[PDB]
Design a protein around this ligand. Sequence first.
Ligand SMILES: O=C(O)[C@H]1O[C@H](O)[C@H](O)[C@@H](O)[C@@H]1O
Ligand SMILES: [Cl-]
Length: 308
Amino acid sequence: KTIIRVGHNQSQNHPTHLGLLAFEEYVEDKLGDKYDIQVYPSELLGSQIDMVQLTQTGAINICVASNAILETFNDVWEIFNLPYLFASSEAYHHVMDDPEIVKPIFESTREGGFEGVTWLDAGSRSFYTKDKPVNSPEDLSGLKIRVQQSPTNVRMMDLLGSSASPMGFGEVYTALQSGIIDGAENNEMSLTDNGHGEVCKYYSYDMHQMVPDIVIANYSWLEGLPEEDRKVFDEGFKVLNEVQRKEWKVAVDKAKEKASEMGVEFIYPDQKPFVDAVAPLTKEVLERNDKLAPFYDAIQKYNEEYPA
Ligand SMILES: O=C(O)[C@H]1O[C@H](O)[C@H](O)[C@@H](O)[C@@H]1O
Ligand SMILES: [Cl-]
């Protein structure tokens, strides 16, 4: 058979793994005599940055990468990394499901060896810290906060009066434990599935970003598929999206409960001071990249249709 290698950086219990297992089962049920889909969880194929590069060369076929890091491969991905971009999770989901918005973005990096085929839900990202609770941006002053390898997020930390420490997701637990960083920012699953709540017990819902995870496929590989095979893989990507999103809802609820049981304290800060502190980032990003405005306009229509 033809081996299709698929990587991601999450545990085997995470929604993304469950979605990819559904993908594998869907495709192999229709075409199993021909393809063996192999899913490599928990950074078995490397950190996310490692995997995107392996996808570019075709050493693996498909991987999952946070939108945060894709902006370094093509600047148009920056659009979904803007802080306080979406008014509501409903606005966000409708945006990511709108082909007129996502297709031009997903296809932007074909010359770099890959294209986006779907997205996966990763909730919203908020600050969590070890020693001191975050109630407003000034509480981040003098802290070192881990972010993804994303110039947008580095700039966001600068505007918050803080300092960014970019590193891969698998490094964060030990970096927190050793005191190399003071905190990080993510959805609630980081606390439980990745153990960050063992060290960080203050989780403050500033909800600065809703950053999609993107499923990317090697472009030569994908376009090389025979018509009928491509149709099955495409259907599989839709199943992946659907199963991951359903499982995400379940998992994030369980994560919140388990975090509480672990001793994490959830804080609900006033978001306005965070919004105002990082507003210049959106102004700067839009001014520098004129590809973005029409996507931003379209997102605003969804914000209006699905407000908070
Ligand atoms: O902050 C990060 O690095 C990670 O954040 C979330 O877990 C996201 O789903 C991952 O794709 C990502 O790698
Ligand atoms: Cl990485």
